[PDB]
């Protein structure tokens, strides 16, 4: 069985150097034709190929990133490292390392190259956020007028934040949107709930951002 | 470099359906193409390698065909765990290009979004910033579009939106769009408008308010 796992820092600041490690087992980077590559995925976006390294030490990089990428392997520790210099916020994404089979051999002779056409085993992935930002609790604002209402959870860092309604008792008609990373490096999100215009019952958003130990209960009315 | 285009970019289907997805390359990639399925929160999983070879452990309902520039993936009988995003990857040329992906969600009846507009709170205004949000609640299909207007001026570069994952009972999507202005700019105008375009609306629905209008 083959397994890969990415490790590194969850946070990095712009202009900094990001170093990622792929620790694997079940194969060796001394095994014929075997490769280990890196792929990234910005939140809500497509996969983007970064680089690959083979057991013969052959290396290739994405052309739009080759001035900031370095890939290296440590055959004895079963690891592959990816260094990305001078990072920026567009570099925040989930980073994956993956295995690439080498050609099939028969009595130490390559007979089938078909299995090399794919990245067959992937690591779970590591999330990396790029912000020049420090731990900061949110400002909670009311979103007031079936009727709609909510709480705007603004300017916090880092993720995540939890939001409930009426202490966990209001679940139906609730929509807590995924946070957006603002240009400022701080997150922001909204939680809204839809109710029978008749009901206007009290409504309060229980907001908790652990990283900053910021707890807020905000009642919202018409 | 090489272009790898998936079609369609989005697709609705139901359990039991036979679906096909395609990936075209701007140049021949021979048979060096792979298909993957990616469920939210997980890494992509290999389904087909070398254009048509079924990867070990992968269910036989997955099949791949084609060579050169035209590839297709077909799932003969959609299972519940197949609602996900699919990707295609080229490995004949460096760099090893990925396609844009095609999302496969649960099909249901067209449902237009309930639109609401929220003005900034006085509490936020005091802080010097003004956030205006538009809510598109429970619609289908997923594609929609919000255009902010301030005194009829089209806003651009000053809003951000985010979408929920398909609802497990509604099979609908909800979207949030936040228009962000400085308090000074916010107070230099009166009509704040959220215009919404959706397939479930004959025409665009606009929701608005007049700032300061008490």
């Amino acid at each position: 069985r083959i397994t890969l796992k990415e490790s590194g820092p969850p946070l990095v600041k712009p202009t900094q150097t990001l170093t990622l490690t792929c620790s694997f087992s079940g194969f060796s980077l001394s095994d014929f034709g075997v490769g280990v590559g890196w792929i990234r995925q910005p939140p809500g976006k497509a996969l983007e190929w970064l680089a690959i390294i083979y057991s013969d030490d052959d290396k290739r990089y994405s052309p739009s990133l080759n001035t900031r990428l370095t890939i290296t392997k440590d055959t004895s520790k079963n690891q592959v490292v990816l260094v990305m210099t001078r990072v920026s916020p567009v570099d925040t994404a989930t980073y994956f390392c993956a295995h690439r089979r080498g050609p099939t051999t028969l009595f130490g002779v390559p007979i089938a190259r078909g299995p090399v056409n794919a990245m067959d085993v992937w690591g779970q992935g590591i999330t990396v956020t790029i912000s020049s930002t420090s731990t900061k609790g949110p400002s909670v604002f009311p979103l007031a007028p079936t009727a709609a209402l909510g709480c705007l959870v603004k300017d916090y860092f880092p993720e995540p934040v939890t939001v409930s309604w009426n202490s966990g008792a209001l679940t139906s008609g609730v929509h807590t949107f995924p946070a957006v990373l603002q240009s400022s490096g701080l997150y922001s999100l909204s939680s809204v709930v839809t109710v029978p215009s008749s009901s206007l019952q009290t409504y309060t958003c229980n907001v908790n951002h652990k990283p900053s130990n910021t707890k807020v209960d905000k009642r919202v009315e018409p | 470099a090489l272009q790898l285009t998936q079609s369609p970019s989005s697709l609705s289907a139901s359990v039991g359906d036979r679906i096909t997805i395609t990936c075209r390359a701007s140049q021949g990639v021979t048979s060096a193409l792979a298909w993957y399925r990616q469920k939210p929160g997980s890494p992509p999983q290999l389904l087909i390698y070398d254009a048509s070879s079924l990867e070990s452990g992968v269910p036989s309902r997955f099949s791949g065909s084609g060579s050169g520039t035209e590839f297709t993936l077909t799932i003969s009988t959609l299972r519940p765990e197949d609602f996900a995003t699919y990707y295609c990857q080229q490995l004949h040329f460096y760099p090893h290009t990925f396609g844009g992906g095609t999302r496969v969600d649960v099909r249901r009846t067209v449902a237009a979004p309930s639109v609401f507009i929220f003005p900034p709170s006085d509490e936020q205004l005091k802080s010097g910033t003004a956030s205006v949000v538009c809510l598109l609640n429970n619609f289908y299909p997923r594609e929609a579009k919000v255009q902010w207007k301030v005194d009829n001026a089209l806003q651009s570069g000053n809003s951000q939106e985010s979408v929920t994952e398909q609802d497990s009972k509604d099979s609908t999507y909800s979207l949030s769009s936040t228009l962000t202005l400085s308090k000074a700019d916010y107070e230099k105008h009166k009509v704040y408008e959220c215009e919404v375009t959706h397939q479930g609306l004959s025409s665009p629905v606009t929701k608005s308010f007049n700032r300061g209008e008490c």
Binding site: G33, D58, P103, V116 | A1, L2, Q27, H92, Y94
Partner: peptide, 11 residues
């Protein structure tokens, strides 16, 4: 367009 071939394109 002028792309470099993969490691195994000439095996």
């Amino acid at each position: 367009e002028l792309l470099e071939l993969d490691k195994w394109a000439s095996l």
